[PDB]
């Protein structure tokens, strides 16, 4: 895994079979959601290596490339002005487990539906795992 | 849902993000598996309505169209010579729940990996739900 632009989508598809991709809501301090994979810029993220030895990274929307995803009140990711907000990206045999820098919580989807806000908390079979693809 | 040819794939993707489609192994009395969606004829199934009131169907591989999927020993589906083997196809708000005619068991995947045999038993969040798409 290396720096560049990526899509990030859940292992669990929508009820209609759509890949549910991390989607920038177009402004800061607004819960980041998933939506059907569609090639829009809101679904492209810049990963920058923070500590390679820690597998930690910053994640920035291409639309606002200096901004970073942080841990929002309500336990949802939100985009913010930069301040070393990082996530651990661990490749497991079930896909990526996206955790905070201290590896105490995980991103998941509760229902895996279009428009759903990403949850930060307990790890979850299947919906706690993600796919990260270049470009 | 109507008679015709379909792909049938899990709501849960492989760890690499591949849609896992029901795949005929090319002979009878051999556990039916899932594999990455690839347009092969082994992934095309003929659905015929058995009883509309009870929502039951026969499922036959296009490769051996008179044959039917039945409930195999070891609780895995297998293909067999026809003898009214049916499955209930219920569209829930989380996708299709594929059960036996009596609605006591469900098809799911334990790990949702390429090559995995389909399990017949407990309903399972996410991996007990399916997507059924024409042709
Ligand atoms: Cl058998």
TrEMBL record, chains A, B:
Q: Which domain of life is it from?
A: Eukaryota
Q: Which residue range or ranges hold the CCL2-like lectin domain?
A: 4-130
The protein's GO terms of the molecular function aspect are:
carbohydrate binding
UniProt entry keywords in alphabetical sequence: Lectin
Q: Does the keyword Protein biosynthesis apply?
A: no
Q: Which InterPro entries match?
A: CCL2-like_lectin, Ricin_B-like_lectins
Q: What is this protein called?
A: CCL2 lectin
